[PDB]
């Protein structure tokens, strides 16, 4: 099946796409404000043939000037100067297409060529172009240098890192970077041909020596396991700490990493790491070092092995104080044994004799992320992260988003932070050459 083209959606009235500036990790986000509706650019002339003389060895492409009418994610609606109607307006992918600052062609000694449809309007287009372009906005000359510098991943193939075992989430397992697409890494577990996709900014991948330092469960080859126990000796293929994104510093804590914030037994809410459509009561099972802690989803069946425990850092945007769902009108997943109609936090804390973790332990500042209900975007299927799909913002709960996959039932909706690295602007797949899943037939 083919990758889904946004084209028919773009060609509809009131189509709403989240702007690139909503996605901090997205390429071009930093310089995107240098773009604007009404700006003028040199763009490829598709409506002309061998009018321009091209010497052998030169690129056989001709350019004309256009105005950007609309911007939807990476998509821009172009309109050639000289046209009276919108008959030849066309959509482009901004960071794929040959779009340039006005004056780019002249630097290469190339002339601008009027499209055939309007070429007759003038013998010399100087007066028209001077009249249309004087005082107008165009692209900064360094624009695409900035874009290209934002395409490269911080990682490369062959790097070894510790990442969560999808078959046993209570431990991290040694894995190697074998594929990179648009900064989404494929990590193949050592001594196996299985693995998973995740963005380079994912909180479930960690540098070499992380598990040992933090105190997380670790599965790895013997030689690696024994190398960790000493300390600490380095290796050429070790993924180091500066490659990894954190919203905190190891210096915030002491050198020993002793933390006394979250405590074992404390109750809270959290997104089910095995079901991103669900938010349910959770319990701190073990406090590790440097803010990391193992928690248990209370909706799970009884399990003393602690194999289904999951590590969240205390500054994670995916853990919430008790009462988060009820306060925001979210249907909470009842803890095992309880019913939807028979569950309250007050009664639940009574029966377990437990204490809910205080609001002060949570760090959830709410930015004006700019996300709105109805906005379209591209979102990774967190259940099958090899897939990136057509998606819509269904709800906005402070800084938490409910993301709906267009064409599917609301049961597949996933909870994602506004600054998650699993959501992307419209046109991202085209830019990075990832396949986009469209709505089911």
């Amino acid at each position: 099946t083919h990758s889904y083209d946004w084209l028919p959606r773009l060609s509809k009235e009131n189509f709403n796409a989240a702007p690139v500036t909503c996605f901090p990790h997205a390429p071009g986000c930093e310089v995107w404000d240098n773009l604007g509706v009404g700006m003028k650019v040199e763009v490829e002339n598709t409506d002309c043939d061998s009018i321009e003389v091209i010497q052998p060895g030169q690129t056989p492409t001709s350019f004309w000037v256009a105005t950007i009418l609309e911007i939807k994610g990476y998509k821009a609606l172009m309109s050639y100067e000289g046209f009276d109607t919108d008959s030849h307006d066309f959509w482009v992918n901004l960071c794929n297409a040959e779009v340039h600052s006005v004056g780019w062609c002249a630097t290469r000694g190339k002339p601008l060529i009027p499209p055939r449809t309007i070429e007759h309007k003038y013998k010399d287009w100087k007066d028209f172009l001077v009249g249309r372009l004087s005082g107008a906005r165009t692209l900064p000359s360094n624009f695409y240098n900035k874009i290209n510098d934002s395409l490269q991943s911080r990682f490369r193939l062959g790097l070894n890192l510790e990442c969560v075992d999808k078959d046993r989430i209570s431990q991290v397992r040694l894995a190697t970077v074998t594929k990179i697409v648009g900064k989404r890494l494929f990590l193949r577990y050592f001594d196996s041909d299985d693995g998973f996709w995740c963005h380079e900014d994912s909180p479930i991948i960690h540098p070499v020596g992380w598990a040992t330092t933090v105190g997380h469960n670790l599965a790895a080859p013997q030689d690696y396991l024994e190398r960790m126990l000493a300390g600490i000796e380095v290796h050429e293929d070790d993924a180091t700490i500066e490659l990894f994104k954190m919203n905190f510093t190891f210096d915030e804590y002491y050198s020993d990493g002793k933390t006394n914030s979250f405590v074992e037994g404390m109750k809270l809410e959290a997104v089910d790491p095995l079901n991103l459509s669900s938010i349910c009561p959770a319990t701190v099972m073990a406090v590790l070092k440097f803010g990391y802690m193992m928690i248990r989803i209370d909706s799970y069946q009884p399990d003393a092995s602690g194999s289904d425990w999951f590590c969240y850092h205390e500054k994670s945007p995916c853990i919430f104080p008790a009462g988060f769902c009820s306060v925001n009108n979210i249907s909470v997943t009842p803890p095992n044994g309880y019913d939807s109609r028979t569950f309250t936090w007050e009664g639940y804390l009574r029966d377990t004799g437990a204490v809910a973790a205080g609001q002060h332990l949570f760090h959830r500042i709410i930015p004006d992320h700019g996300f709105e209900v109805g906005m379209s975007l591209e979102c990774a299927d967190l259940m099958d992260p090899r897939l990136v799909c057509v998606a819509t913002v269904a709800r906005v709960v402070g800084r938490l988003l409910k993301v709906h996959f267009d064409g599917w039932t609301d049961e597949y909706d996933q909870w994602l932070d506004c600054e998650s690295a699993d959501i992307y602007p419209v046109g991202w797949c085209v830019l990075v050459n990832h396949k986009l899943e469209g709505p089911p037939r």
């Binding site: 004056g103 002249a106 190339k110 002339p111 001077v130 372009l133 004087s134 005082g135 165009t138 692209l139």
Partner: peptide
């Protein structure tokens, strides 16, 4: 945006056609 808020510059641009060359005064962010 610019010129209201952030940084912007005037930029003189060179344009060629098959009838001649000329200059236009435009602007861009940064």
């Amino acid at each position: 945006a610019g010129m209201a808020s952030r940084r912007w510059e005037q930029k003189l641009v060179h344009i060629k056609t098959m009838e001649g060359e000329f200059s236009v005064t435009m602007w861009a962010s940064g």
